[PDB]
Amino acid sequence: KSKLPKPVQDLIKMIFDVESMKKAMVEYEIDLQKMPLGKLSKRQIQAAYSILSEVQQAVSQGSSDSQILDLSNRFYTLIPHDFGMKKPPLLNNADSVQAKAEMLDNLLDIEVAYSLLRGGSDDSSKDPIDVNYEKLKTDIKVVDRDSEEAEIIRKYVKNTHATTHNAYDLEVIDIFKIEREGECQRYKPFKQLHNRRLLWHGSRTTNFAGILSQGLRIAPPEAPVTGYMFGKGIYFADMVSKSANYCHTSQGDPIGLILLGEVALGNMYELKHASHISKLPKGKHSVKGLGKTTPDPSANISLDGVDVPLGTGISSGVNDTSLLYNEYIVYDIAQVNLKYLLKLKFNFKT
Ligand SMILES: O=c1[nH]c2cc(CN3CCCC3)ccc2n2cccc12
Numbered sequence: 001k002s003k004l005p006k007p008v009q010d011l012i013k014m015i016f017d018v019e020s021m022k023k024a025m026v027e028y029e030i031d032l033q034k035m036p037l038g039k040l041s042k043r044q045i046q047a048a049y050s051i052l053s054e055v056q057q058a059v060s061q062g063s064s065d066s067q068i069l070d071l072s073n074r075f076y077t078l079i080p081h082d083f084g085m086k087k088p089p090l091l092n093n094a095d096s097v098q099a100k101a102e103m104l105d106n107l108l109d110i111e112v113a114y115s116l117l118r119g120g121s122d123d124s125s126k127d128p129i130d131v132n133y134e135k136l137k138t139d140i141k142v143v144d145r146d147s148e149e150a151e152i153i154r155k156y157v158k159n160t161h162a163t164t165h166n167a168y169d170l171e172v173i174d175i176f177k178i179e180r181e182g183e184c185q186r187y188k189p190f191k192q193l194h195n196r197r198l199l200w201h202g203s204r205t206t207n208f209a210g211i212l213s214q215g216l217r218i219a220p221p222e223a224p225v226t227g228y229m230f231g232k233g234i235y236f237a238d239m240v241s242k243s244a245n246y247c248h249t250s251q252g253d254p255i256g257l258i259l260l261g262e263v264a265l266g267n268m269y270e271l272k273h274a275s276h277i278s279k280l281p282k283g284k285h286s287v288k289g290l291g292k293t294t295p296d297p298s299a300n301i302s303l304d305g306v307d308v309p310l311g312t313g314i315s316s317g318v319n320d321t322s323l324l325y326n327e328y329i330v331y332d333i334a335q336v337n338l339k340y341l342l343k344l345k346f347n348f349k350t
Contacts, residue, residue: 004131021113034285042112046117051075052097078090101223120135167347178212187334196306198262198339199260218232237326238295258341261336270288288326292316293324294314296310297311
């Protein structure tokens with residue numbers, strides 16, 4: 001039987017939950033009969049990215065009907081939905097394709113996830129959990145509650161979480177220290193890069209099997225460009241409140257997972273509005289999206305050189321921005337070093 005700590009075994013089940021994969025899909029109105037998990041293929045998701053990009057181009061071009069209705073029918077044919085005696089929604093605007101594009105993203109993490117699960121050895125010698133664990137390629141340990149680390153992380157979570165978006169309260173059930181296999185010699189060269197910060201990265205529970213196995217990736221060129229604030233990259237927040245919004249928890253499933261990663265930001269390109277960048281100005285290595293709020297800078301604490309902005313949220317310098325909180329973006333995968341994984345319970349104020 002498994003020699004892992006219980007909280008670790010419990011985390012493994014959480015991330016390899018098949019039911020959660022199905023619920024996440026039906027919740028998207030995906031027809032499970034025609035498109036079951038087993039029929040999920042990346043090649044089919046890439047094609048849908050491409051059709052969605054083809055709809056944005058037609059939308060922005062202002063095509064004469066028939067063209068939008070056909071491209072819309074093409075997408076719904078490739079990605080089987082079930083809306084009953086009602087035709088799917090016409091993808092004729094930016095809001096509409098962005099929603100579909102974000103859908104494909106998670107659908108892909110589910111496909112990646114299911115591929116990992118339904119793959120490997122079929123023996124019965126080792127207990128599944130130990131097998132599933134090995135599939136992640138990440139060393140996972142429990143962070144003691146009465147540990148300075150845990151205290152740091154708890155303060156960061158509590159401080160950067162306030163009462164103006166307090167439609168819920170956050171309680172840390174488990175903190176895990178993470179080290180993905182190899183994710184060391186890849187980040188190290190960037191470790192000689194100042195402006196290293198400990199930042200948040202929230203994501204739905206069904207996307208962790210993928211993020212751990214392969215780390216945080218960047219969207220492919222075929223993906224639609226609509227919705228992105230600062231181009232295709234890895235998005236981080238310095239306030240748990242902003243990130244917590246991507247865990248997609250509810251009263252039914254009140255438990256999510258949040259990542260704390262060290263990011264070698266370097267000199268940041270500071271912006272206040274959505275820009276088409278991805279290509280940095282010479283001498284800059286990251287983008288900072290200036291939010292109206294930011295943790296009180298006076299309460300920053302750098303660890304090992306790593307900056308930890310756990311200050312309580314204050315009004316920032318400028319609110320003439322389009323963002324409510326700070327956003328940090330990197331366009332190189334080796335600039336991130338995932339350090340912690342948090343399991344959190346959300347208590348809704350309703
Ligand atoms: O912490 C963050 N997580 C996050 C997650 C998503 C959704 N994933 C993208 C691909 C699959 C699901 C989208 C935007 C963010 N984000 C933006 C600023 C900070 C975060």
